[PDB]
Amino acid sequence: SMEQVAMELRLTELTRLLRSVLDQLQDKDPARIFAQPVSLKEVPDYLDHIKHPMDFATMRKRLEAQGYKNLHEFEEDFDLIIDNCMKYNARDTVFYRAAVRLRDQGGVVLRQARREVDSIG
């Protein structure tokens, strides 16, 4: 139908906006602490601690499958990256500290993305 196509065009354009959002958020992690999944070879007990692992590569796979239906779903995954790190790692660690900086700096980017999504429908 013509409606299913129009909807698909909306999803494509959302995917295009979320791709730029993801690139901006990831620049706020220059150390690449959050780039890839925590290795279960190197942290074999991780899943005993963290029930819903997340990272930027896993978000990118979902994004390219147009697996994000709205910005809320995308923010949920970003928030998991931060919140998982801040639980697993102690406050006095480079990992925790990197999450805090990503959270603070990403908030700016996400604040305007929410407006661009409401604005452009």
From Swiss-Prot:
Domain of life: Eukaryota
Subcellular location per the Swiss-Prot or TrEMBL entry: Nucleus; Chromosome
Cross-link (Glycyl lysine isopeptide (Lys-Gly) (interchain with G-Cter in SUMO2)): 41
Location of the Bromo domain: 9-113
Tissue expression remark: Highly expressed in testis.
Assembly mode: Component of some HBO1 complex composed of KAT7/HBO1, MEAF6, ING4 and BRD1/BRPF2. Component of the MOZ/MORF complex composed at least of ING5, KAT6A, KAT6B, MEAF6 and one of BRPF1, BRD1/BRPF2 and BRPF3. Interacts (via PHD-type zinc finger domain) with unmodified histone H3. Interacts (via PWWP domain) with dimethylated and trimethylated 'Lys-79' on histone H3.
Annotated function: Scaffold subunit of various histone acetyltransferase (HAT) complexes, such as the MOZ/MORF and HBO1 complexes, that acts as a regulator of hematopoiesis. Plays a key role in HBO1 complex by directing KAT7/HBO1 specificity towards histone H3 'Lys-14' acetylation (H3K14ac), thereby promoting erythroid differentiation.
Protein name as annotated: Bromodomain-containing protein 1
Species of provenance: Homo sapiens
Residue span relative to the full protein: 555 to 674 of 1058
